[PDB]
């Protein structure tokens, strides 16, 4: 009963037959900005179903040497569909996200993915005094790969990452993970091109294994922005 889930948002739907409940980060749900928390006084555009829909990113191959993958929000979506166009035309943005992570394999496969949403995942570089550059951080839709997932690329640890909102994909048990993220920021809105509220991370704590004939085992990421608001209409930065 908590293994089958349908998510419907706008013109998009996802069904899964092997979920493991789903996470609402910190027990929150996305909502629009109330008047008692507003700063910017222009009337916001609320595009609803034009933006509040699943976008599916390029799938990555899970391979025996894989260190894990990450995608930054809103950056990974800033160039996609009508969400991206509103990002490019507006100074200010606010939304939640619905994250659905997909990975199926046979009953003869084994492997476990930690699927974790990290708020303000400020990265470190390895073995240098120089801070990470713009091109190290801003990957867009492709996302990045972990250099040292064991310290989360930030001198910290993977083992304690379960303090952040997460599920697991354990190929024995489930083929999908779902995390619902509220707006997570100190300011009520932000400029979407220079700050990321959330990093999705997928780390293979138990590596992919089988003795059947090998197949490509992709991991697929689908993300729906939720309750998108935009303020400060301008030309496109683009």
């Amino acid at each position: 009963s908590d293994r089958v889930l349908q998510l419907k948002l706008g013109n998009s739907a996802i069904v899964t037959q092997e979920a493991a409940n789903y996470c609402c980060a910190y027990g929150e749900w996305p909502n629009y900005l109330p008047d008692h928390e507003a700063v910017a006084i222009d009337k916001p555009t609320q595009p609803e179903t034009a933006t509040d829909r699943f976008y599916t990113l390029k799938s990555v191959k899970w391979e025996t040497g894989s260190t894990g993958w990450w995608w930054k929000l809103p950056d990974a979506l800033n160039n996609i569909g009508m969400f991206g166009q509103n990002v490019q035309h507006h100074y200010l943005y606010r939304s939640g996200f619905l994250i659905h992570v997909q990975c199926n394999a046979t009953k003869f496969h084994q492997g476990a993915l930690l699927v974790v949403a990290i708020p303000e995942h400020q990265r470190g570089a390895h073995n240098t005094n120089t801070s990470p550059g713009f091109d190290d951080i801003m990957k867009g839709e492709e996302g990045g790969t972990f250099n040292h997932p064991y310290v989360l690329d930030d001198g910290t640890s993977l083992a304690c990452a379960t303090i952040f909102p997460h599920q697991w994909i354990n190929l024995r048990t489930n083929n999908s993970a779902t995390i619902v993220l509220p707006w997570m920021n100190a300011a009520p809105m932000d400029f979407p091109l220079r700050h990321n509220q959330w990093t999705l991370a997928i780390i293979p704590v138990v590596p992919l294994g089988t003795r059947t004939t090998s197949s490509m085992v992709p991991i697929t990421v689908s993300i729906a922005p939720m309750c998108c608001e935009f303020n400060g209409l301008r030309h496109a930065i683009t």
């Binding site: 996470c23 609402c24 303090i163 048990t173």
Partner: protein, 38 residues
């Protein structure tokens, strides 16, 4: 003892015993029962 005019001057507020650990231990949309989880 606070004779200063600004309330941020005051001593520390060590009295908030409210907790909600379930926002970190149980952020599941459907709560666990005592009962096969899945």
């Amino acid at each position: 003892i606070n004779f200063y005019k600004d309330s941020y001057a005051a001593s520390a507020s060590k009295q908030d015993f409210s907790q909600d650990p379930s926002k970190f231990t149980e952020p599941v949309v459907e709560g666990l029962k005592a009962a096969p989880v899945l």
